[PDB]
Amino acid sequence: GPLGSARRLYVGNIPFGITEEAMMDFFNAQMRLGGLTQAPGNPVLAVQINQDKNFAFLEFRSVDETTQAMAFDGIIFQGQSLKIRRPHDYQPLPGAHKLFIGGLPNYLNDDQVKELLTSFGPLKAFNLVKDSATGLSKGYAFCEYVDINVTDQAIAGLNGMQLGDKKLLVQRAS
Amino acid sequence: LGSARRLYVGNIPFGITEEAMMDFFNAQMRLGGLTQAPGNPVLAVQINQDKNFAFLEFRSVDETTQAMAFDGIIFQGQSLKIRRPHDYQPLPGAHKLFIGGLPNYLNDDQVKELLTSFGPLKAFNLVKDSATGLSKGYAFCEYVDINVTDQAIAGLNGMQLGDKKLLVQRAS
């Protein structure tokens, strides 16, 4: 980051004694059969394995093909379900997955509204909108999760749901 | 792996040397086109003359698998019995163990001390944060004798270890 790590992926739970070359051939074949490549040839350029800790990193030829490959999370390779993830250095650009939260009781303070949200996971941003003259809540807020996969989970768990005698609205801010 | 590069050879004739047997198998492999590079696939041979058997050791896993087709092959008038070692693992990593719920202050050798009360280990690693160098509270291992695995699971899984409860299961 901010622009680094855009063309690599973490692979965990790899099969025992598997070679770099065989893992490369496996992923290149799946990209092709699954229709995920965007040009003739092989998207995966190189594979590096850590034998002792049982994981790999893949290196891709393009930014968009790296992103498509994430669809393979869970794929079974020699009896093993593979865990596919972004590198830890990889971050989306700011505000990319911001949420609007509305329909909140306006007698609730910031920490009480945060406590509903952090039940799904840690936040990296949060604000509850207040009238500046009085400091009183307007009953709506914005947030952003550290992990971006938690976003769909909070939406599915909270949107349209009863809170008091109001139905909460939880959706993407743009 | 290691036992994935050996074969048992029985019914061996009296008087045969380790070098005569090494030459025979290298010659058979080349003749049947079963080698996957230039050179000789058999690195070493050890013979027990009192019990009429030998072990072969190969340079690769796939050449070892290939030589399995030599069961019944004639050497000095006699048919040889070719088999896998008794501790060969068809599905490797099957007995690798996950150890979770470890106190986060314990170092590698302290965790191994817990595990080697059941027997010697062939593999071990404690997972640490690369940034700080600090234990994440879990490890992996394999025993030299795979039959101890379940006796380690029975001994440790669910045991209170200070402030936390251990999970010991096959990593699978």
Domain that holds residue B100: 91-146
Residue A50 burial (CB count, 10 A): 10
Residues B133 and B160 in one domain: no
Residues B153 and B121 in one domain: no
Closest residue in B to A52 (Cα) is B125
Q: In total, how many domains does chain A have?
A: 2
Nearest to A171 by CA among A121, A96, A98: A98
Q: Does A17 touch chain B (CB under 8 A)?
A: yes
Residues A3 and A69 in one domain: yes
Residue where a domain stops, chosen among A50, A74, A93: A93
Residues A107 and A66 in one domain: no
Residues A85 and A14 in one domain: yes
| Coil, strand or helix at B159 | coil
Q: Does A88 touch chain B (CB under 8 A)?
A: no
Residues B63 and B75 in one domain: yes
Residue where a domain stops, chosen among A67, A93, A119: A93
Residues A51 and A124 in one domain: no
Cβ under 8 Å to B: A residues 93-112? none
Q: Does B92 touch chain A (CB under 8 A)?
A: yes
Do residue B92 and residue A16 have CB atoms under 8 angstroms apart? Answer: yes
Residues A58 and A126 in one domain: no
Residues B69 and B107 in one domain: no
Do residue A16 and residue B93 have CB atoms under 8 angstroms apart? Answer: yes
- Give the resolution in Å: 2.4
Name the one residue in this structure whose structure tokens are 């250095």. Answer: A89
Kind of pairing between the strands at A8-12 and A55-60: antiparallel
Our CA-based measurement puts residue A54 at a distance from the nearest CA of chain B, in whole angstroms, of 10
Residues B5 and B34 in one domain: yes
Name the one residue in this structure whose structure tokens are 């971050």. Answer: A91
Collect all residues of chain A within an 8 Å Cβ-Cβ radius of residue B93.
15-17
Do residue B92 and residue A53 have CB atoms under 8 angstroms apart? Answer: no
How far is the CA of B33 from the CAs of B1, B29, B37, B50, B71, in angstroms?
A: 24, 6, 10, 34, 17
Partners of A23 in the beta sheet?
none
Residues B27 and B55 in one domain: yes
Residues A15 and A73 in one domain: yes
Q: How was this structure determined?
A: X-ray
Residue where a domain stops, chosen among A93, A128, A151: A93
Our CA-based measurement puts residue B50 at a distance from the nearest CA of chain A, in whole angstroms, of 36
Taking the C-alpha atoms of residue A144 and residue A137, their distance in angstroms, rounded to an integer, is 19
Do residue B127 and residue A17 have CB atoms under 8 angstroms apart? Answer: no
Do residue B61 and residue A17 have CB atoms under 8 angstroms apart? Answer: yes
| Coil, strand or helix at A110 | helix
| Coil, strand or helix at B38 | coil
CATH number at residue A2: 3.30.70.330
| Helix, strand, coil percent values for chain B (each to nearest 5) | 25, 30, 40
List of residues 6+ apart from A30 with CB closer than 8 A:
A36, A72, A75
> Torsion over CA of A38, A41, A42 and A45, rounded to 10 degrees?
-100
